[PDB]
Amino acid sequence: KFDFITKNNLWTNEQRDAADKVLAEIDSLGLEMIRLSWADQYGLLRGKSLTVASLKSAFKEGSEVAIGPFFFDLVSSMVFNLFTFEDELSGNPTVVMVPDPTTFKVLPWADKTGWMLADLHWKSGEPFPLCPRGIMKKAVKSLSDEGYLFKCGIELEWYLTKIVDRSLSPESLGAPGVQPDAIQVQPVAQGYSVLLEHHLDQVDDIMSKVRKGLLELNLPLRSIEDEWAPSQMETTFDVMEGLEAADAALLIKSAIKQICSRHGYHATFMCKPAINGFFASGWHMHQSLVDKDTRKNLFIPSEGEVLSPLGRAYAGGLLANGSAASSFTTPTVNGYRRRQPYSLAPDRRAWAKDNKAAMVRVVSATGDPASRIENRIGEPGANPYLYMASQIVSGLDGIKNKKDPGELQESPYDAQVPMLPTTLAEALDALEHDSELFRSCFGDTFIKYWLQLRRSEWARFLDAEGAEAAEPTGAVTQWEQKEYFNLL
Amino acid sequence: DFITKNNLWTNEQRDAADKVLAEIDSLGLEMIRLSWADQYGLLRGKSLTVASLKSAFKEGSEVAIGPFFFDLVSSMVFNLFTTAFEDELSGNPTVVMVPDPTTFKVLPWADKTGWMLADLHWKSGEPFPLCPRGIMKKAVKSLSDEGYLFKCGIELEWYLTKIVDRSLSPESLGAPGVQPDAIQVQPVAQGYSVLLEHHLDQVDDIMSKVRKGLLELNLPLRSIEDEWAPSQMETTFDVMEGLEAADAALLIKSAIKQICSRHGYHATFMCKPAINGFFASGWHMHQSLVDKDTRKNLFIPSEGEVLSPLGRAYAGGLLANGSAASSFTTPTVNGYRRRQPYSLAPDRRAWAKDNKAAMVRVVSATGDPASRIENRIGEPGANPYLYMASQIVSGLDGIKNKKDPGELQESPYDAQVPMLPTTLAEALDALEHDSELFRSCFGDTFIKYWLQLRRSEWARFLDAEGAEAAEPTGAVTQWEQKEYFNLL
Ligand SMILES: Nc1ncnc2c1ncn2[C@@H]1O[C@H](COP(=O)(O)OP(=O)(O)NP(=O)(O)O)[C@@H](O)[C@H]1O
Numbered sequence: 024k025f026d027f028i029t030k031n032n033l034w035t036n037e038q039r040d041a042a043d044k045v046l047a048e049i050d051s052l053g054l055e056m057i058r059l060s061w062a063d064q065y066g067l068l069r070g071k072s073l074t075v076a077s078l079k080s081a082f083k084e085g086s087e088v089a090i091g092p093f094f095f096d097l098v099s100s101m102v103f104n105l106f107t108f109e110d111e112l113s114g115n116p117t118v119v120m121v122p123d124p125t126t127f128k129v130l131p132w133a134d135k136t137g138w139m140l141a142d143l144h145w146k147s148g149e150p151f152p153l154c155p156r157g158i159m160k161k162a163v164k165s166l167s168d169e170g171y172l173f174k175c176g177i178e179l180e181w182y183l184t185k186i187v188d189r190s191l192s193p194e195s196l197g198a199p200g201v202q203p204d205a206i207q208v209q210p211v212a213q214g215y216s217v218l219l220e221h222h223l224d225q226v227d228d229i230m231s232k233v234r235k236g237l238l239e240l241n242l243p244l245r246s247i248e249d250e251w252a253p254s255q256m257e258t259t260f261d262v263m264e265g266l267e268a269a270d271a272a273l274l275i276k277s278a279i280k281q282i283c284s285r286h287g288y289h290a291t292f293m294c295k296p297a298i299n300g301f302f303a304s305g306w307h308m309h310q311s312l313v314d315k316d317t318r319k320n321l322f323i324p325s326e327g328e329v330l331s332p333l334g335r336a337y338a339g340g341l342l343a344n345g346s347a348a349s350s351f352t353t354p355t356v357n358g359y360r361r362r363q364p365y366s367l368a369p370d371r372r373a374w375a376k377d378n379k380a381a382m383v384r385v386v387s388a389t390g391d392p393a394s395r396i397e398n399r400i401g402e403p404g405a406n407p408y409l410y411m412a413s414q415i416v417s418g419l420d421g422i423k424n425k426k427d428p429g430e431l432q433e434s435p436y437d438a439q440v441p442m443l444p445t446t447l448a449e450a451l452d453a454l455e456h457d458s459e460l461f462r463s464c465f466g467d468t469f470i471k472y473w474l475q476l477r478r479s480e481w482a483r484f485l486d487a488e489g490a491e492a493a494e495p496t497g498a499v500t501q502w503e504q505k506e507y508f509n510l511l
Numbered sequence: 512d513f514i515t516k517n518n519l520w521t522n523e524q525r526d527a528a529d530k531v532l533a534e535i536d537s538l539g540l541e542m543i544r545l546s547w548a549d550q551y552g553l554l555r556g557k558s559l560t561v562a563s564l565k566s567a568f569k570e571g572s573e574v575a576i577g578p579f580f581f582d583l584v585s586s587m588v589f590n591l592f593t594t595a596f597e598d599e600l601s602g603n604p605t606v607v608m609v610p611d612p613t614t615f616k617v618l619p620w621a622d623k624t625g626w627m628l629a630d631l632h633w634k635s636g637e638p639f640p641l642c643p644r645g646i647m648k649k650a651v652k653s654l655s656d657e658g659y660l661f662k663c664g665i666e667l668e669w670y671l672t673k674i675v676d677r678s679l680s681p682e683s684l685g686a687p688g689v690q691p692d693a694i695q696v697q698p699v700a701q702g703y704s705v706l707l708e709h710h711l712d713q714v715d716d717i718m719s720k721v722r723k724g725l726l727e728l729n730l731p732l733r734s735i736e737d738e739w740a741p742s743q744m745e746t747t748f749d750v751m752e753g754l755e756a757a758d759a760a761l762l763i764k765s766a767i768k769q770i771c772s773r774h775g776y777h778a779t780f781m782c783k784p785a786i787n788g789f790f791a792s793g794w795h796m797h798q799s800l801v802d803k804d805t806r807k808n809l810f811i812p813s814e815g816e817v818l819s820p821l822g823r824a825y826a827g828g829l830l831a832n833g834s835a836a837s838s839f840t841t842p843t844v845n846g847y848r849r850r851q852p853y854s855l856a857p858d859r860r861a862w863a864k865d866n867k868a869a870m871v872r873v874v875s876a877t878g879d880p881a882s883r884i885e886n887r888i889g890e891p892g893a894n895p896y897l898y899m900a901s902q903i904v905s906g907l908d909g910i911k912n913k914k915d916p917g918e919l920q921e922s923p924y925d926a927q928v929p930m931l932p933t934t935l936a937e938a939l940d941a942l943e944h945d946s947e948l949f950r951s952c953f954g955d956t957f958i959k960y961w962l963q964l965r966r967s968e969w970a971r972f973l974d975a976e977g978a979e980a981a982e983p984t985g986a987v988t989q990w991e992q993k994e995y996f997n998l999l
Pocket residue numbers: 174175176177178245259260261262307309310311320379386392393394395397573575
């Protein structure tokens with residue numbers, strides 16, 4: 024068989040050793056299938072399930088796939104002509120999924136099934152420019168080149184509901200460009216009784232299975248918590264690093280959804296479902312930089328500081344680029360329901376010490392290795408690679424250009440600072456009008472592609488619900504429910 | 512190491528932490544709940560993994576004070592958005608849950624789950640002033656400084672019902688400041704045949720599970736009894752001491768509710784549910800003081816006495832402060848349904864020997880170490896910490912000022928003594944106009960906070976049902992059912 028991986032130098036020695044160990048574990052465990060997957064532009068896992076023999080072949084030749092998913096939106100509108108590359112963004116070329124053996128997992132909820140991520144490459148051997156994991160890799164290398172590792176604490180809010188109807192009737196299936204029916208669900212608990220232990224116990228018949236699945240995947244689960252709204256959950260994780268953290272967040276969301284569905288439940292990372300009483304869910308990103316060699320947290324402040332100078336410049340970069348990065352931290356139309364004051368979610372580019380109204384909330388103390396920046400702007404349905412890469416790119420831009428975050432705001436909701444985009448369209452406008460950094464770091468081809476795609480989605484939303492409905496405080500529309508509830 | 516830096520663990524607590532970690536590993540536990548009682552006595556907190564708990568044994572676990580500024584339906588009674596603290600009572604600072612390893616339990620009804628209480632501290636290291644367990648700690652220390660230990664017999668009445676509908680439909684979930692629907696239930700047995708053995712047998716398929724859970728928690732279960740009303744139960748426990756006794760009462764109520772819910776039943780400590788035929792439930796507090804060194808009961812009477820002089824003065828303090836303490840022993844609007852005569856509940860500040868019509872009932876015999884005071888004023892839904900601490904503070908005040916209870920009442924419902932508050936508002940007035948003692952021991956800030964919070968709750972009740980509805984002999988309102996039935 025042709026060895027595409029060796030010829031194109033796509034595996035490190037570490038990856039090759041891991042490939043040997045992975046095959047040994049597959050044999051020892053008697054696995055029958057190994058999923059080969061990769062995140063699309065929305066963070067959703069696409070790929071194939073291979074047999075053992077086919078995976079062994081893929082460890083030399085890769086596995087061919089079409090780029091179709093990149094040119095579809097969530098309902099398979101054809102945004103880019105698959106029938107008619109970086110210049111025109113058209114066609115259906117074949118790319119090669121090259122497995123990343125360091126990502127291998129055994130999926131506990133499935134029958135004799137393993138799981139692995141793949142990187143997309145042209146048959147020429149070059150990375151596919153639209154691959155979001157590749158964009159995270161570029162961000163990680165840019166940060167390594169400067170002496171730093173990205174340390175990230177994953178804090179995810181989500182909704183846990185019980186399935187009433189999976190909406191499988193032919194009349195509910197939609198069509199290309201036509202949303203299918205949302206799954207029908209029922210809340211699993213009452214709410215507005217935050218952090219209530221009895222809520223944790225009431226849902227633990229299924230939540231214990233979620234917990235066990237996450238632990239058995241060797242994910243660093245830290246806490247399970249009862250959030251404010253009915254059936255709203257929160258799961259946090261211990262600190263992870265760079266690509267691993269992004270891969271982990273991706274797998275975490277996938278595992279929660281799959282386990283829940285296996286038992287007749289529906290988990291969703293849709294920011295604010297159209298269900299009475301459901302409040303918006305957030306994805307706050309906890310971030311620190313550590314020295315590649317000394318492994319010390321370089322954000323730790325001395326006395327009379329809230330952050331080290333380096334951390335202060337990182338925060339400056341987060342603030343300065345918060346509008347341009349908005350479509351990456353907050354990619355869904357529905358995620359902008361959180362862009363309003365008095366929400367404990369951010370409406371403006373302000374930093375503050377421990378104040379949960381700020382976009383950038385600093386949590387720190389002299390000599391404390393937990394000292395960190397929390398960016399509260401993200402939504403749970405964000406693509407982990409694009410979210411984390413936007414954070415790295417913004418913070419590194421702040422360090423290189425010595426950006427100043429300005430004064431810590433005591434009342435962030437009164438701060439005389441730039442407002443954040445209130446709609447996805449505003450976020451795309453902000454990116455278009457301030458595109459240089461993300462063109463340079465994510466790639467010009469990717470930014471062109473991203474703008475075109477997301478704008479087509481906004482146009483669909485506008486056509487279905489009208490401009491008035493985009494107001495963040497307005498009720499969640501049926502378009503949002505039928506776009507995001509089932510898949511995110 | 513926040514705990515070591517602030518000297519927050521005794522050497523016994525550190526030894527206990529070692530043992531707790533060893534037991535967690537030996538049993539293969541996967542989750543450990545870290546909880547604390549809020550102002551209503553409800554358990555709030557997080558569920559942590561083994562790794563996260565090990566970290567919390569050094570740095571504690573951060574949590575927001577949100578629950579203290581919410582009422583039972585999450586009315587925002589204090590402004591979480593304006594950064595203040597003890598003068599302003601506003602804001603949303605982060606505090607540190609410091610685990611108390613001496614409280615560790617394995618929860619028998621849950622999957623591989625341990626459980627622990629936590630004390631709330633500012634990040635400066637000082638105790639958080641609104642924390643009710645801390646108020647109990649201060650009462651216990653105040654009592655110890657005088658040479659005494661608090662011995663308490665826990666006697667809880669409650670209702671056992673079978674769930675018909677958990678009221679989980681979106682239209683039933685309420686909203687912040689808006690009560691959700693009560694759970695719908697069915698009685699499990701007829702009543703008005705008190706202490707009937709056949710009733711005990713009829714309910715023992717579920718009551719046996721409650722019994723086993725309490726026994727496996729190593730709680731000193733003493734009796735299970737058929738109380739007067741249909742489906743009304745009573746569970747008593749052998750004598751416990753001080754802070755343990757309060758912690759145990761908290762765990763007892765939580766365990767009863769969780770076991771019952773796990774099996775499709777609803778236990779409630781709501782005083783008098785809006786269910787036809789349900790009579791009011793009480794929490795009589797059996798109390799004695801023991802000498803810290805001799806370990807002897809200092810209430811034991813001589814011949815021609817019903818209590819030693821010390822016990823008689825303690826009783827005097829209980830009576831003298833009974834109106835000011837009313838919101839603590841009887842914090843619920845619904846609990847004042849018991850403030851009426853000919854009820855076997857107290858309507859006045861009278862004491863008597865073995866008369867169940869009195870507030871302070873003496874049970875004693877010459878030289879009998881069971882000699883004690885039973886205060887019949889409390890309701891089952893009381894916060895264990897606030898109820899017990901109010902008792903300690905009142906009795907110690909009686910001792911210090913040599914307060915005289917007056918003459919024993921042969922007919923308490925005809926006694927020439929001050930009447931007890933008949934509404935929560937009256938109880939808050941009594942505390943406000945006579946606050947010095949409870950300000951001195953519970954703290955000014957807590958008393959200011961308590962008054963403001965409970966008055967907002969009374970205002971909600973008044974607006975929903977009118978003043979006319981507060982008359983104790985009136986029917987239980989839907990507001991009471993939708994405020995207390997689900998959570999208490
Ligand atoms: N140095 C660090 N760098 C990055 N993340 C860190 C660091 N130290 C701690 N974390 C992470 O920070 C997160 C803490 O989140 P959590 O305990 O939910 O509190 P919070 O996010 O500060 N508050 P909240 O919005 O109110 O829920 C965890 O994911 C930790 O692993």
